[PDB]
Amino acid sequence: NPTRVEEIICGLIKGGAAKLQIITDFDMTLSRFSYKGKRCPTCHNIIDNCKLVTDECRKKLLQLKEKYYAIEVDPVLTVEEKYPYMVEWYTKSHGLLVQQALPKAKLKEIVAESDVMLKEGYENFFDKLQQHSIPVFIFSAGIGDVLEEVIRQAGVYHPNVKVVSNFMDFDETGVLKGFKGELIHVFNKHDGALRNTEYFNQLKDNSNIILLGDSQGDLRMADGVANVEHILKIGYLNDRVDELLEKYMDSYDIVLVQDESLEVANSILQKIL
Numbered sequence: 001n002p003t004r005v006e007e008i009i010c011g012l013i014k015g016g017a018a019k020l021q022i023i024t025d026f027d028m029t030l031s032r033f034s035y036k037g038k039r040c041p042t043c044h045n046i047i048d049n050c051k052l053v054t055d056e057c058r059k060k061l062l063q064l065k066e067k068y069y070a071i072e073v074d075p076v077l078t079v080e081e082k083y084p085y086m087v088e089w090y091t092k093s094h095g096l097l098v099q100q101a102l103p104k105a106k107l108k109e110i111v112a113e114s115d116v117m118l119k120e121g122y123e124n125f126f127d128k129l130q131q132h133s134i135p136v137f138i139f140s141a142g143i144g145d146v147l148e149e150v151i152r153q154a155g156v157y158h159p160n161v162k163v164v165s166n167f168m169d170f171d172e173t174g175v176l177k178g179f180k181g182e183l184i185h186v187f188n189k190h191d192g193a194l195r196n197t198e199y200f201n202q203l204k205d206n207s208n209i210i211l212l213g214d215s216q217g218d219l220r221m222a223d224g225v226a227n228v229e230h231i232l233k234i235g236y237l238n239d240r241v242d243e244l245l246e247k248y249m250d251s252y253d254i255v256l257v258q259d260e261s262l263e264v265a266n267s268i269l270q271k272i273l
């Protein structure tokens, strides 16, 4: 546990900004799980709960949620048995969203009036990384158009930041018809990582990596990195804590239980940069 974590961080310190890159999840990793006693929304929830979606549709999304979430957290099932149900889940949700006919124009309003919140310390996080031109690869199974507007309106969509997620596909009217590329969901981030080899091949020298996640599946996000000399994995354990603590402890290097800040990441960066 602790000696190894320190030997990784020392590796990171020695390499400095010159060798560093960040790979990180968005939902519940950069954004908060809860705030002042209320649950906070995922990207998908921002759209689910906004003015441009009817109640009957919001009912149907909740019916899906409790059908498929129950299957997702099901302990008995191996992750490959769950894999099709997850694929089925994301398709129907987007299917329901596509029928609502979301205007691209409205997205900035929806995010503006949402309950979304980035973790405490995010300004320091993004600004320090921008200052030293550290590449940031945000890799999310949410909605790209939503995510982008959150960090844009927060003032931290700097030029070093790359976003890979499920992006919306609009018609000639600017009305949503579907989603682009191949679906990114909770269990298949290994595939997306290898698909972005073009990006990582340009950062061969950046052999020091910090990976921030909140699910088990986020552990695969560095499978496309060209050269790995040192990698540190910081994991936010926000929910299902008693069930998953042992397991997170055995796979992430630093486990932060119900921690709504980035101050551990920030403190480590202060040392490296």
Ligand code: BEF
Pocket: 025, 026, 027, 028, 029, 139, 140, 141, 142
């Ligand atoms: F954005 Be991650 F997929 F939660």
Ligand SMILES: [Mg+2]
Pocket: 025, 026, 027, 028, 029, 214, 215
């Ligand atoms: Mg997440």
